[PDB]
């Protein structure tokens, strides 16, 4: 027998590479190549591990880079680090009316201005100051850019393939009987949320529970719903915006008086739908534990204002809703209104050095969205208590990128055959 | 859940002899040594691996669910309490005698 050479063979290996984008905004879109064909590979089984997937870290650092790049050409609010004079506005005690001296377009003259500040944004030293005046430097977000998520497709370079798992009952790890090949993923809207996943993708078969190793209580548990749970969030206040000339060609946007009465912002969720989704979750979670065990629920134990409350962005404004009423039940074997708070000084991505100011939005803010998953923490130590937890944004992306994996294509092979070269 | 057992409660070993203590547990197992009045120190972190700076005489072997801690050339300062731990759960250790 004699060895031969084949240049086209279906062979793949595990490797990590740079994935590019295919599709103003904070995440730069229209800088992505405009965008299909999907091939089903038959009689192939491959192993997927979503807890060491590399496509999560790359997308995390890409989104961080996009945020930093988009905040660069905007106004710096360094002259706003000043001693304010705040007074009560007459949701009692939440708003403040603060007056202060500010610089003007002439270097040797000043002006006296005022603005409406939330209670969560000021601290005392009658004299108040911003929260970040001792830890961080604050920059204003440009009003042109929009915070609304837009789907982004991640595509592999030439010579590289993306394999996805089409198994409906697939958990976090293990072989996938039904495999397929694409070169660009589905639209993945970048949404930030700490306790409830919003605008996600549903499960076709049923609720699914995935953790790295469920015996370890230090690992979060990801729950994926099969039907959405509609939630309606609103800010009833009618806001008015102002402009202040703080330098040569530099404007700071302040809030004017609220037109009409002042009411609390909130969110509504349906009681029956949530009382059925909790039952399905309890059953699928009782699969792992003993049938005699009883499943409790409780609200978060403690932490930051970002992990104790469900935090999100509703049309350019930041909400921190209290979800103590959702997670209060015990299972053995009308609507729910969630009060929310609003903050303007936003420090995110778990950095302690770079703050950001969100300009006020005039009008009434309304959001209608789905709830497509939960992130929980089981307490350790015949009953189990599960409390919502979050704060790390890589779980949010693991929830979406569990199917896909990236493979090198190696097309050279030397097989035996019965022929010789003349 | 986690089922755990420590059979060699009290042991009487002489200097220079080799002894073993059996810990039965589910999951990753750690061997710790704690002198009386002092904070525990890590000896074996996975049940068969050794920690940096520990004497080479200490070693461990895992056979099925059973775990064994083996030492050779016992020293006068080598007599203390030794316990196995798994995640949050731990059982009181074994005290040897001179």
């Amino acid at each position, epitope marked *: 027998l004699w060895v031969t050479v084949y240049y086209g063979v279906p062979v793949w290996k595990d490797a990590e590479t740079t994935l590019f984008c295919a599709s103003h905004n904070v995440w730069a879109t229209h800088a992505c190549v405009p965008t299909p064909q999907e091939i089903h590979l038959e009689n192939v089984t491959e192993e997927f591990n979503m807890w060491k997937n590399n496509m999560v870290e790359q997308m995390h650092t890409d989104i961080i880079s996009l945020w930093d790049q988009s905040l660069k050409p905007c106004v710096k609010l360094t002259p706003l680090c000043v001693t304010l004079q705040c007074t009560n506005v007459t949701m009692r005690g939440e708003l403040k009316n603060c007056s202060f001296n500010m610089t003007t377009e002439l270097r040797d003259k000043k002006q006296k201005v005022y603005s409406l500040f939330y209670r969560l944004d000021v601290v005392q030293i009658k004299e108040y100051r911003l929260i970040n005046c*001792n*830890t961080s430097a604050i920059t204003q977000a440009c009003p042109k850019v929009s915070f609304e998520p837009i789907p982004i497709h991640y595509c592999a370079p030439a010579g590289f393939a993306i394999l996805k798992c089409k198994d409906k009952k697939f958990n976090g790890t293990g072989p996938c009987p039904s495999v397929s090949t694409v070169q660009c993923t589905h639209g993945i809207k970048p949404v930030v949320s700490t306790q409830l996943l919003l605008n996600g993708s549903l499960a076709e078969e049923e609720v699914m529970i995935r953790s*790295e*190793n469920i015996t*370890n*209580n*230090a690992k979060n548990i990801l729950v994926q719903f099969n039907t959405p749970v509609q939630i309606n969030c609103t800010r009833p206040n009618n806001n008015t915006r102002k402009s202040i000339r703080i330098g040569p060609g530099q404007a700071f946007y302040a809030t004017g008086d609220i037109i009409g009465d002042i009411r609390q912002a909130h969110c509504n969720v349906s009681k029956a739908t949530w009382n059925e989704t909790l039952g399905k979750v309890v059953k699928q979670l009782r699969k792992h534990f003993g049938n005699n065990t009883i499943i409790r629920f409780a609200n*978060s*134990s*403690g*932490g*930051d204002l*970002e*992990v104790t409350t469900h935090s999100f962005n509703c049309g350019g404004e930041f909400f921190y809703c209290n979800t103590s009423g959702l997670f209060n039940s015990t299972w053995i074997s009308d609507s729910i209104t969630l009060p929310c708070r609003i903050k303007q000084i936003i420090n995110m991505w*778990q950095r*302690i050095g770079q703050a950001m100011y969100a300009p006020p939005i005039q009008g009434v803010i309304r959001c209608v969205s789905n709830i497509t998953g939960l992130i929980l*923490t089981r*307490d*350790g*130590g015949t*009953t189990e*208590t599960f409390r919502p*937890g979050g*704060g*790390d944004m890589r779980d949010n992306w693991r929830s979406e990128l569990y199917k896909y994996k990236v493979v090198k294509i190696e097309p050279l092979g030397v097989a035996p055959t019965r022929c010789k070269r003349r | 859940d986690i089922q755990m057992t420590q059979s060699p409660s009290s042991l009487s070993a002489s200097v220079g002899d080799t002894v073993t203590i059996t810990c039965q547990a589910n999951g*990753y197992l*750690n061997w710790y040594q704690q002198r009386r009045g002092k*904070a*525990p*120190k*890590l000896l074996i*972190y*996975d049940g068969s691996k050794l*920690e940096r700076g520990v004497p080479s005489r200490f070693s461990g072997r895992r056979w099925g669910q059973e775990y064994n801690l083996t030492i050779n050339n016992l020293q006068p300062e080598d007599i203390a309490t030794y*316990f196995c*731990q798994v*995640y*949050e*759960f*731990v*059982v*009181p*250790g074994t005290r040897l005698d001179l």
Partner: nanobody
Amino acid sequence: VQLLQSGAAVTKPGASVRVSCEASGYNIRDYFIHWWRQAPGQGLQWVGWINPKTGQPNNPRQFQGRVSLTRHASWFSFYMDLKALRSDDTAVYFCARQRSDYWDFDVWGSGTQVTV
């Protein structure tokens, strides 16, 4: 990578106590910190962990409602609280530094011996 612990304290039942615990040695945000308490002549008992990045605590059913854990970053000191004490809460408390998925602790504090 060394953990400094505060001194001992004696208090009456139905009081509050604080046991500061500070880490100065390493990159602190990347590792959890656990608390253990032991009674005289008995094995260790788990009390719970705290996440340095977000401050999320975790406690067993017996201790929940009585103990709260808090951290205070500086431009890292970990605390512990006990709202309601009792005769049997006299123990010794240790800080531990988890560093892997095996829950192996390689650094411990000197310990605080609290009597009631």
